Amino acid sequence: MSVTVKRIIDNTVIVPKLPANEDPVEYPADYFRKSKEIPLYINTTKSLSDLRGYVYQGLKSGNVSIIHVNSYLYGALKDIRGKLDKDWSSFGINIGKAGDTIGIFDLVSLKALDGVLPDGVSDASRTSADDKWLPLYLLGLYRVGRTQMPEYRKKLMDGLTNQCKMINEQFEPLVPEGRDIFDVWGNDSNYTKIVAAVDMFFHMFKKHECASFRYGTIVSRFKDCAALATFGHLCKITGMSTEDVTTWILNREVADEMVQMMLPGQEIDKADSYMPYLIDFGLSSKSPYSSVKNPAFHFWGQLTALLLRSTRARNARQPDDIEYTSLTTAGLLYAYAVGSSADLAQQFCVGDNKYTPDDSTGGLTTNAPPQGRDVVEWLGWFEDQNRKPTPDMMQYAKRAVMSLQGLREKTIGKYAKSEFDK
Amino acid sequence: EDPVEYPADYFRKSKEIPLYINTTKSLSDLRGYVYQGLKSGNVSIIHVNSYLYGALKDIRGKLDKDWSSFGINIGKAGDTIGIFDLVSLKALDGVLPDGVSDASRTSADDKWLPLYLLGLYRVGRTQMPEYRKKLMDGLTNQCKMINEQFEPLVPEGRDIFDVWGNDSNYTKIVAAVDMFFHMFKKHECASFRYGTIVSRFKDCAALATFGHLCKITGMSTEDVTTWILNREVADEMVQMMLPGQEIDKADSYMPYLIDFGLSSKSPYSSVKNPAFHFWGQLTALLLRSTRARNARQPLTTAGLLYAYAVGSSADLAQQFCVGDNKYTPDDSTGGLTTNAPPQGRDVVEWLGWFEDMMQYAKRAVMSLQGLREKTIGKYAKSEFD
Amino acid sequence: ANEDPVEYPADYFRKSKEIPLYINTTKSLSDLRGYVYQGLKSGNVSIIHVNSYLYGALKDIRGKLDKDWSSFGINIGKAGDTIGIFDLVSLKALDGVLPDGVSDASRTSADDKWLPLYLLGLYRVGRTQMPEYRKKLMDGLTNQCKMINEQFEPLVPEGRDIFDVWGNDSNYTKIVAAVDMFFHMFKKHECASFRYGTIVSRFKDCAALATFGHLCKITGMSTEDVTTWILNREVADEMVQMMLPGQEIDKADSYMPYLIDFGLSSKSPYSSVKNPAFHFWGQLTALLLRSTRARNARQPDDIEYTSLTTAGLLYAYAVGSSADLAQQFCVGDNKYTPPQGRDVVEWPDMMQYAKRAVMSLQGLREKTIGKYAKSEFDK
Amino acid sequence: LSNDFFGMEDMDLYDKDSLRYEKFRFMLKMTVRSNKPFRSYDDVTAAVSQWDNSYIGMVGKRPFYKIIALIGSSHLQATPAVLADLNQPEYYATLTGRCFLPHRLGLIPPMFNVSETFRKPFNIGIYKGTLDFTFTVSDDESNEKVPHVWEYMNPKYQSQIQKEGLKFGLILSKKATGTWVLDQLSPFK
Amino acid sequence: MDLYDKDSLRYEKFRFMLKMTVRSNKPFRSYDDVTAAVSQWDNSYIGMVGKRPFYKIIALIGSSHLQATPAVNQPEYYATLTGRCFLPHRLGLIPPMFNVSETFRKPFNIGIYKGTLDFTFTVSDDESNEKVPHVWEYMNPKYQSQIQKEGLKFGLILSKKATGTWVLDQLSPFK
Amino acid sequence: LSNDFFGMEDMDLYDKDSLRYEKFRFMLKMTVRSNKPFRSYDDVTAAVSQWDNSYIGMVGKRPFYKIIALIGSSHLQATPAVLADLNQPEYYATLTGRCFLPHRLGLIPPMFNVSETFRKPFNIGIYKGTLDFTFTVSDDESNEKVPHVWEYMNPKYQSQIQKEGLKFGLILSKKATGTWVLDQLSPFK
């Protein structure tokens, strides 16, 4: 515990501990210490043509099995092509070494699935023109089956149809208009492993001739990592150095949230790593970078970015069961600090011409904005303003939240318009 | 009221959880038994328990880490484990009902029928027709996601499944299933969590509202326990936090202390822990939490004091520093004697200040449209508005 | 006789000419390695097995002595002969029953690199009794072990600490102190990382001597001259019992710093509980001279405080207000020249100096010297 | 041995293999799952003898764990699922009691009443699957007379026990008195 | 090479015990199939290495003396041989043996035939001065080209000394 | 050698080729892709023998890696893709266990439990393609007796292991008892 707790009637300890209502965080490093490989269980006791017919007729009839589609996706994505130029070591796993060609499944361990294989709807009239567009469609359904609302799922389906038509050019749609079955595919573990492996392989080889398969699997990149994504967005919208931003966080829950967010041995700064797929590969059952596990920082950063007039931070869902006063005050203080007092300091110099005039009546004590970006100096100004934000901050928030037509319910924009636009 | 029983006491008394079932029947004969009983509304609890054991022998599911709990050697990181491998299995010494055994049912049970049987357990615990109908519709949607025909078996009425919760073996089975599928979230049969999720933290609303309070106030559990007062919340919290109960471990036997029969009276319940539940729910409601609007009313001064302390006096304190430059100016007229809120969160300082809140409660509670009887929301609207 | 009479290492070495080490060696090295390893994961490892494994894995005869290493009339080594850890303690056979053991047959011979280091580190860890220091020591131990093995999945479970009892076993303390002193003699040994977790055995239960040295080092005053300032009439007997001649307390490579872990002394005379007044005086004096060390030592009980505070304030004022500034090196000639001196006979402003010294301290410590001074010299 | 190197005189407490009886009670739970029914006890022993392929459990009870596995394999009763075609057959066996085993494996370290579980797969060719175990081998310092350990295995199975015991790693030698004695285990086990 | 009988003929007498047990999917057709099924008994040999040639010759005598059980469901063969005999071998000095039995089982995969094996070997030393019979009359062989070839593909190698005593040359598994 | 220059006397620890047994457990994964199916196992040995044309891997395990490559080539079972006309024939083989290899290569450095992958295309003329490897060769200090390493090859294949085992660069011999001892690798390799 932090320190001891004493209830003074008998000088006794209580040692409180939170209930396990939500599962604790799991890091990819712990999983990769436990096991040195990522198993992938599939049923390979079938020919490629038979599996292709199985998946084709199942998609056309809307009753395709997950085992059949997983096996067919393995069979049609054995493209060893793709030559590494540099080493691709990640989490102590040697995927390749600077010149040896690797496949999609060369980065995940492969095993044999223990189970019974469904019969199927085998067809023999479908030729070997499948690798061009069928894995694309099968992976696109994975991303499509996460919107849970028609007016976006329709656009995603149209995009997938265009993506496949650019390759095949006939592409009569397979899945019927209704009767969805790809919603369940996310639950299966092997399908997520395959789709995330495909996404990372085609992310390493962007210029691959089959790089179009990134459509429908790009959602797997940084999946359930909303807190990390909003931290990056905040660091990019504020313009301040990414390390000075963390000094500004307040409210005593954002700090511990940050500490669990960036444990050093997690490798969250390397693009070609296993970290962005900590939940699709099964590395972590509960991603510490998720928004449900990290509500306070997500809310505060989204509010700050919205106050800095960012188009991204207007649709993020406002987290529930968190404070909406202290975080809002901290975000407003940060926004007034960055968006009003521009740093605007000399950066490069030719031998000389460096400093600033400190003897030209450089007064500091005044009822004016600090005209700086240091956290301590703005905090001193705020506490001299007895922790009650000035009406000028309200005016800045009103200017930064007004004219935001077409807001989204339960999102940050609606709350900001209801709160900072009294 | 019955004395509080802790899971550690039970696990000291016995080193295993017995599951009494009668398995002298084939799996197909039992699938017919339970199917015809559900369709005719005359299924027996012994038959349903035997069938649930028979259709849930999925040794599949590979552990990745040790799963010790209460000194029980559940598994070691790599060995496959089944649902019933975490409860001891015995033979039920009892009579087996005659039954309505069928023969035309194929091997399509493991897909959706245990789901139906476990879901009706949660269904037969509401006693609100609207909520029960909504849960039944969700159950029908969940089962139709697997077999897609799923003609409902139990009739529109005839809640024979209400008594199912009385039987200890059925509760043990459903809680074991919930534990197994909570350990393995990404299992291919994880849909069974529907209907058995109610077993998770069952009869433990006091601990749930403690977690809700700790999540809604921003203050740590180490500091919320400092604000306990009134001398019943204090020893209430003391009895809530016995050390060896292992309440902070997710994959433990604690959340099912009443379904496994580890405790006859759950210490973390509401009828045994009324005052802390009321205080936490009232405070959370005063902190604008939608969850604290429906809990049954089983302290108000303490809750209002804490709510004003945490909802008005924002902290905004420096917590990350670049090497140096950390402190706050104490020489800039840092007075402390005034007729103003302390602008802090310390319990002793706010207690000294106590030695505007009406308006704060009014604004935190007004316009609370759509309240329900016995709820904390109605109490706050009638009292703190 | 509430406190046991002090025992000196000289008395023990006059009584017995060797330090026995009773261990059970009727087990192969791999068997004992598996025993202790699976016990550490299972949290039910026996002390006999861990002592036997520690002996079996630390038989590194490597380490060449450069100078003689005699101590208390013991011919440990003679300037050139290779020496091991257990050549400095006599070894016997333990009489008893050996428990079953849970040995794993898949454990390779990658134990000596990191497992003795972990097993010794749990000895230092099992003395804090407070979560913060224990957790930081665990972090340091994991960092040290990962520097060698680089895998190091932690063995002992997070809860149910079984290593607090290990310190109560005499043989384990003997082994850990022998390892500590052997690696102290050979600083640059390739296995010197084992010193982590056993440095607590160095000068264990000798905080009074440590604070005497700190007082001699912070004031710059000579150790022969500081003892002239002993006052209060109880510090005198304390200092006399400190400096009995035949103890070699000034010898680093001697058996003295482990007078309690080796079992040489049951009640160490240099301990702080047996030396309360001297420890209090020295620590208060060091605090009054702005020393960061003298803000965490526990304030001793059952001793008068006013006289010790007066003496400490007097000595602190003498050090802080009377700088020496005297000619000490002369080139042939040119030698000669508050009392403005440090002589004992020569020696509201003192409370002003104490207040200046004790103010501006953030985060004091309960029951320690710093909080007592803040509550005593900051009125 | 002494012919190889110098100075390996044995202890005079027990010369080489001093016989002695170790009183102990026990408990057992066992569950063997296979893809096909076991035609004979031969396949049962073949599938079971791989329970300790990777030994993680307590080692001071390894011969006793082996003999308890032997009695469990002897008493593997079937289940209604072992019929023609219902599911994968799943055998079950539990035994509880007290017994004394004459053995010459040296003085055994003291035992404690702690449960140990084993979960390993087997692949003997035709048959595949896993196992399950729950040992409670502990010392019995009482003086009540107990039935012999080999008595617990009925002679209806085990056409000849001298090799059925060996199948699990045991080494037996009939003393012609009727009480089999455990000589040692399989090489370096 | 050594002056004092490095790799020359050596007469080694022993006491053995054999319990042959062979099972197959359908009854055996030719003795060649019996040899093929038996020869895969030591796919993973764990027992004493010094007793390997003796174990292979005991498996050979078990193969020669295999009779089907009267029950012949699945064909279950059975045999049991015991005797006192001496082996002339050219494998050099052999380690001393003991009166301990060792188990054996490996499922043979010879294509057509599926099944397992079960051995019980108790080859032990014998320092008794009593004259012991030869190993090779325990057979029922044809000295022309049968025993030299039926046991050849067990790995055994035989030679001619013109005396009629079959002397063991060398063991050649998977060769 | 000594016939050439002055003073190259051998050491007294191992005279020239002092035979020693090195017990070690291992693991193996293999994947051989080719344009056409391998008609004979000899072509398989030819295609796998150049798996270390540019060698980056272990030295103390290089003979062990060669023997593991040999055992993997022995058990290179085909796949359903190897049938008449589906795609390029992809082979696969995996082996795990423990074994001891008698060899006269001198004392070996202590091996660790570390895995190394290997990738290299092969060109044996008619046949194109690449390889794949994953070795886990490491020491085993347990007294547990292990099967002989050369026993892991079934007698069904490798009619002459003296050359089938030599295709990979090894030099074999016979210990006059039926156990093959590894003399050395290919000379100067």
CB F119 to CB A47 under 8 A? no
Which residue does chain A place closest to F90, by CA atoms? A78
Distance CA B360, CA B47 (A): 57
Of D55, D56, D109, the CB nearest to C100: D109
Distance CA B378, CA A368 (A): 47
Residue with tokens 């969160």: B345
Distance CA B294, CA B299 (A): 18
3-state secondary structure A220-251: HCCCCCHHHHHHHHHHHHCCCCHHHHHHHCCC
Return the amino acid letter for E96.
P
Overall size of chain C counted in residues: 379
Looking at C150, C171, C201, the residue that finishes a domain is C201
Per CB-CB distance under 8 Å, the chain C contacts of D55 are 104-105
Per CB-CB distance under 8 Å, the chain C contacts of A3 are 132
Q: Are residues C211 and C197 in the same domain?
A: no
Distance CA D109, CA C364 (A): 53
Distances (CA, A) of B95 to B33, B48, B101: 15, 14, 16
3-state class (DSSP) for residue D32: strand
Q: Is C151 on the interface with F (CB under 8 A)?
A: no
Surface-to-core class of residue D55, CB atoms within 10 Å of its CB (0-12 exposed, 13-18 middle, 19+ buried): buried
Looking at A179, A194, A220, the residue that finishes a domain is A220
Per CB-CB distance under 8 Å, the chain E contacts of F177 are 49, 52-53, 91-92, 171
Helices and strands in chain C, H and E counts = 13, 2
Q: Is D99 on the interface with C (CB under 8 A)?
A: no
Distance CA B285, CA B287 (A): 5
Q: Is A98 on the interface with F (CB under 8 A)?
A: no
Q: Which structural technique was applied?
A: cryo-EM
Which residue does chain C place closest to D53, by CA atoms? C105
Distance CA E144, CA A137 (A): 72
Task: Provide the b/e sequence for C182-211 (b: ≥16 CB within 10 Å).
Answer: bbbbbeeeebebbbbbbebbbbbbbbbbbb
Distance CA A258, CA A239 (A): 19
Q: Are residues C268 and C339 in the same domain?
A: yes
Per CB-CB distance under 8 Å, the chain F contacts of E53 are 177-178
Which region, left, alpha or beta, applies to residue F147 given φ > 0 means left and ψ of -120 to 50 means alpha? beta
Which residue does chain D place closest to F97, by CA atoms? D53
3-state class (DSSP) for residue B20: strand
3-state class (DSSP) for residue C331: strand
Distance CA A342, CA C324 (A): 55
Distance CA F22, CA F9 (A): 26
CB proximity list for F159: less than 8 A, separation 6 or greater: E175
Return the amino acid letter for E9.
L
Residue C377: other Cβ atoms inside 10 A: 24
Give the number of domains in chain A.
Answer: 2
* Distance of residue C109 Cα from the nearest chain F Cα, in angstroms: 7
3-state class (DSSP) for residue E129: coil
Surface-to-core class of residue F70, CB atoms within 10 Å of its CB (0-12 exposed, 13-18 middle, 19+ buried): buried
CB F33 to CB A80 under 8 A? yes
HSE (CB half, 13 Å, CA atoms) of B134? 5
Find out whether A40 and A23 touch, Cβ atoms under 8 Å.
no
Return the amino acid letter for B113.
L
* Distance of residue A196 Cα from the nearest chain F Cα, in angstroms: 22
Find out whether B24 and B96 touch, Cβ atoms under 8 Å.
yes
Tokens linked to F153: 């090859």
Find out whether A144 and A219 touch, Cβ atoms under 8 Å.
no
Strand pairing partners for F15?
none
Tokens linked to C63: 């380490």
Instruction: For residue F50, give the nearest of F25, F78, F73 by alpha carbon.
Output: F73
Find out whether C7 and C266 touch, Cβ atoms under 8 Å.
yes
User: CA angle, D101 as apex, D100 and D107 as ends, to 5°?
Assistant: 105
Distance CA C59, CA B372 (A): 76
Q: How many beta-carbon pairs below 8 A join chains D and F?
A: 7
Distance CA C355, CA B273 (A): 51
Strand pairing partners for C267?
none
Alpha helices in chain B (DSSP H): 7-13, 27-40, 45-55, 113-123, 129-144, 168-183, 205-217, 221-224, 233-240, 274-286, 300-312, 347-354, 357-365, 376-383
Distance CA A304, CA A334 (A): 7
Per CB-CB distance under 8 Å, the chain F contacts of C151 are none
Per CB-CB distance under 8 Å, the chain F contacts of E109 are 154, 156
Phi, psi of E33 (to 5 degrees): -65, -40
Q: Are residues C234 and C302 in the same domain?
A: yes
Distance CA B178, CA A252 (A): 34
Strand pairing partners for D77?
D92
Distance CA B294, CA B291 (A): 7
Q: Would you say C293 is a known binding-site residue?
A: no
Q: How far is CA C375 from the centre of its chain?
A: 30
Find out whether C342 and C319 touch, Cβ atoms under 8 Å.
yes
Residue with tokens 């604070």: C211
Which region, left, alpha or beta, applies to residue A54 given φ > 0 means left and ψ of -120 to 50 means alpha? alpha
Which residue does chain D place closest to E49, by CA atoms? D187
Surface-to-core class of residue C140, CB atoms within 10 Å of its CB (0-12 exposed, 13-18 middle, 19+ buried): middle
Residue with tokens 């909303």: A226
Strand pairing partners for D134?
D117
Find out whether C251 and C208 touch, Cβ atoms under 8 Å.
no
Alpha helices in chain C (DSSP H): 9-15, 29-42, 47-57, 115-125, 131-146, 170-185, 207-218, 223-226, 235-242, 276-288, 306-321, 349-358, 369-376
Q: Is D134 on the interface with B (CB under 8 A)?
A: no
Q: Are residues C168 and C238 in the same domain?
A: no
Please state the residue numbers annotated as binding site of A for RNA: 143, 152, 206, 214, 286, 317, 408
Phi, psi of E83 (to 5 degrees): -175, 180
Distance CA A196, CA A38 (A): 12
Per CB-CB distance under 8 Å, the chain A contacts of B243 are 15
Strand pairing partners for F22?
F101
Instruction: For residue A297, give the nearest of A246, A221, A336 by alpha carbon.
Output: A246
3-state class (DSSP) for residue D92: strand
Tokens linked to A411: 């999102």
* Distance of residue C139 Cα from the nearest chain D Cα, in angstroms: 28
Find out whether C279 and C207 touch, Cβ atoms under 8 Å.
yes
Q: Return the biggest CA–CA distance within chain A.
A: 88
3-state class (DSSP) for residue D95: strand
Report the CATH number that the domain containing residue B16 is assigned in CATH. Answer: 1.10.3570.10
Q: Are residues A85 and A118 in the same domain?
A: yes
Q: Do chains F and C touch (3 or more CB pairs under 8 A)?
A: yes
Which residue does chain D place closest to E104, by CA atoms? D167
Tokens linked to B100: 């309505």
* Distance of residue A4 Cα from the nearest chain C Cα, in angstroms: 9
Distances (CA, A) of C207 to A104, A239, C269, C275: 63, 53, 10, 9
Q: Are residues A188 and A49 in the same domain?
A: yes
Phi, psi of A368 (to 5 degrees): -130, 160
Residue F84: other Cβ atoms inside 10 A: 4
Find out whether A338 and A239 touch, Cβ atoms under 8 Å.
yes
Find out whether A182 and A63 touch, Cβ atoms under 8 Å.
no
Instruction: Using CB atoms, list chains with 3+ pairs below 8 Å to chain E.
Output: D, F
Q: Is F86 on the interface with A (CB under 8 A)?
A: yes
Q: Is F113 on the interface with C (CB under 8 A)?
A: yes
Return the amino acid letter for F39.
R
Find out whether B365 and B380 touch, Cβ atoms under 8 Å.
yes
**How far separated are the first and last CA of chain E, in Å rounded?**
24
HSE (CB half, 13 Å, CA atoms) of E9? 12
User: Which H/E stretch holds residue E68?
Assistant: strand E67-68
Distance CA C206, CA C202 (A): 9
Sequence-ordered strand ranges (E) for A32-95: 41-42, 89-90, 93-94
Report the CATH number that the domain containing residue A281 is assigned in CATH. Answer: 1.10.3610.10
Find out whether A21 and B216 touch, Cβ atoms under 8 Å.
no
Distance CA B25, CA B34 (A): 12
Q: How far is CA A176 from the centre of its chain?
A: 31
Distance CA A238, CA B172 (A): 54
Distance CA D41, CA D91 (A): 13
Find out whether F30 and F76 touch, Cβ atoms under 8 Å.
yes
Return the amino acid letter for B291.
R
Per CB-CB distance under 8 Å, the chain D contacts of E46 are 186-187
Looking at C201, C227, C261, the residue that finishes a domain is C201
Return the amino acid letter for D106.
G
Per CB-CB distance under 8 Å, the chain A contacts of B314 are 251, 325-326, 329-330, 387
Q: Are residues C139 and C264 in the same domain?
A: no
In DSSP notation, B63-111 reads --S---BTTB----TTSB--SGGGSEEEE--SPPP-----S---S--TT
Instruction: For residue A243, give the nearest of A375, A414, A119 by alpha carbon.
Output: A375
Q: Are residues C184 and C39 in the same domain?
A: yes
Tokens linked to C114: 């990191």
Residue with tokens 């030819």: F46
Which region, left, alpha or beta, applies to residue B218 given φ > 0 means left and ψ of -120 to 50 means alpha? left
3-state class (DSSP) for residue B281: helix
Helices and strands in chain E, H and E counts = 3, 10
Distance CA B50, CA B38 (A): 15
Distances (CA, A) of D160 to A101, B315, D167, E55: 59, 81, 12, 21
Find out whether B299 and B276 touch, Cβ atoms under 8 Å.
no
Strand pairing partners for D102?
D21
Instruction: For residue C363, give the nearest of A275, B326, E60 by alpha carbon.
Output: B326
Tokens linked to E174: 């998977």
3-state secondary structure chain F: CCCCCCCCCCCCCCCCCCCEEEEEEEEEEEEEECCCCCCCHHHHHHHHHCCCCCCCCCCCCHHHHHHHHHHHHHCCECCHHHCCCCCCCEEEEEEEEEEEEEECCCCCCCCCCCCEEECCCCCCCCCCCCCCEEECCEECCCCCCCCEHHHHCCCCCCCCHHHHCCCCCCEEEECCCCCEEEEECCCCC
Q: Which residues in chain C (7-36) have CB-CB distances under 8 A to chain D?
A: 31, 34-35
Instruction: For residue B302, give the nearest of B313, B294, B310 by alpha carbon.
Output: B310
Helices and strands in chain D, H and E counts = 3, 9
Find out whether B51 and B33 touch, Cβ atoms under 8 Å.
yes
A1 in any annotated domain: no
Distances (CA, A) of E24 to E109, E113, E116: 10, 6, 7
Q: How far is CA D152 from the centre of its chain?
A: 12
Find out whether A81 and A101 touch, Cβ atoms under 8 Å.
yes
Distance CA C119, CA C179 (A): 12
A15 in any annotated domain: no
Find out whether F179 and F21 touch, Cβ atoms under 8 Å.
no
Find out whether D30 and D72 touch, Cβ atoms under 8 Å.
yes
Sign of the Cα pseudo-torsion (D93, D96, D98, D104, in order):
positive
Q: Do chains F and A touch (3 or more CB pairs under 8 A)?
A: yes
CB proximity list for B131: less than 8 A, separation 6 or greater: none
Per CB-CB distance under 8 Å, the chain F contacts of E39 are 155
Residue of A182, A249, A285 to mutate, testing the B interface (most B Cβ within 10 Å of its Cβ): A285
Q: Is D86 on the interface with C (CB under 8 A)?
A: no
* Distance of residue F145 Cα from the nearest chain D Cα, in angstroms: 6
Instruction: Using CB atoms, list chains with 3+ pairs below 8 Å to chain B.
Output: A, D
Distances (CA, A) of C83 to C261, E89, F131: 21, 53, 52
Per CB-CB distance under 8 Å, the chain B contacts of A247 are 318, 320-322
Chain E interface with D: residues with Cβ < 8 Å: 19, 21, 46-48, 73-74, 100-103, 105, 107, 114, 116, 118, 120
CB proximity list for F138: less than 8 A, separation 6 or greater: C108, F24, F25, F26, F111, F112, F113, F114
Residue B334: other Cβ atoms inside 10 A: 9
DSSP structural state of residue B201: T
In DSSP notation, C109-169 reads S--TTTHHHHHHHHHHHTT--SHHHHHHHHHHHHHHHHTTTS-----S-SSS--TTSGGG-
Please state the residue numbers annotated as binding site of B for RNA: 122, 131, 185, 193, 265, 296, 372
Distances (CA, A) of E117 to D124, E59, E114, E155, F178: 11, 11, 11, 18, 22
CB A188 to CB B188 under 8 A? yes
Distance CA F189, CA F185 (A): 6
Find out whether A38 and A193 touch, Cβ atoms under 8 Å.
yes
Of E45, E90, E171, the CB nearest to F151: E45
Alpha helices in A262-356 (DSSP H): 295-307, 326-340
State the residue range of the domain holding A160.
29-220
Distances (CA, A) of B346 to A2, B157, B227, B356, F111: 16, 55, 9, 19, 59
3-state class (DSSP) for residue E83: strand
Q: Is F145 on the interface with C (CB under 8 A)?
A: no
User: Which H/E stretch holds residue D165?
Assistant: helix D161-167
